[PDB]
Amino acid sequence: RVDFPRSRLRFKEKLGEGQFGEVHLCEVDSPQDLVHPLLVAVKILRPDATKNARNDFLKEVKIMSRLKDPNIIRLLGVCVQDDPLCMITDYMENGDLNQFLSAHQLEDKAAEGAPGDPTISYPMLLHVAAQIASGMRYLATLNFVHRDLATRNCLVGENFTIKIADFGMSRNLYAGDYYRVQGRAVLPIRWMAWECILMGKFTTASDVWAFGVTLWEVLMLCRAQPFGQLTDEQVIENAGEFFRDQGRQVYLSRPPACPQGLYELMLRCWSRESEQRPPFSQLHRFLAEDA
Ligand SMILES: Nc1ncc(Oc2cccc(CCNC(=O)c3cccc(OC(F)(F)F)c3)c2)cn1
Secondary structure: OOOOOHHHOEEEEEEEEOOOEEEEEEEEOOHHHOOOOEEEEEEEEOOOOOHHHHHHHHHHHHHHHOOOOOOEOOEEEEEOOOOOOEEEEEOOOOOEHHHHHHOOEEOOOOOOOOOOOOEEOHHHHHHHHHHHHHHHHHHHHOOOOOOOOOHHHEEEOHHHOEEEOOOOOOOHHHHHHOEOOOOOOOEOHHHOOHHHHHHOOOOHHHHHHHHHHHHHHHHOOOOOOOOOOOOHHHHHHHHHHHHHOOOOOOOOOOOOOOOHHHHHHHHHHOOOOHHHOOOHHHHHHHHHHOO
């Protein structure tokens, strides 16, 4: 099945960089002809990319080809017949959600405002969170497990639209969010269900746990790291307390912006029993309909 026409991509700005690739903002004139212009993001494999990096790139494209939802990153096209390998996706103009919320302050306003405005309202936070829940609801229907849900992996577009993505665990900006040990998978422990930390297997139910923490982030306006006053080792030992179930495990505290009713739903996402955690359809309905 034919590549996207590589010649159509007019490169404008370099958005980001990794040791293997770089991401660019491109515009596409006359998107009408493709069966004023469209902005897209493209990830391109750098010419010095190892054999292993190329393989990972091709697998990433295949994985991404599964996912077709308004609130998940979308694979618009590819250029892989020739080099450099190219992956084309939605451009989300307001960047990653963690940096976005970090730059905002909470205000009680009836004005929807703009993503550029210095403040954001509580109803809008609920709307951000609902969109993530809706994305995750879709992934759950495919039994697709994300494994790294967090605000650093979400993107914000015009009019506060949200898309879930996955940028890997290697960005220096978020190094503090990962627990690294020689010979082991890198783990986002502060977002991980206890059974994930102890046994290393991920499920939709552990994605629900991570969503609870992602919700906590959003309601904190990303002002502080989950369990930020505790060390990595204490976070890992906390998973042990969940397993022993002697009532000594600890939870994230209620954000100021978070009403008690919503907090109680958040706490359910952190149920010891995976089966007692809310399904994403119920999480989505609560945020979309129940404030
Ligand atoms: N400004 C701006 N605008 C848009 C932008 O986005 C991208 C730009 C270039 C490349 C990508 C794709 C990265 N790969 C994934 O996201 C990925 C991979 C595997 C599974 C996966 O599952 C999931 F969708 F469920 F998460 C997701 C996104 C970034 N910056």
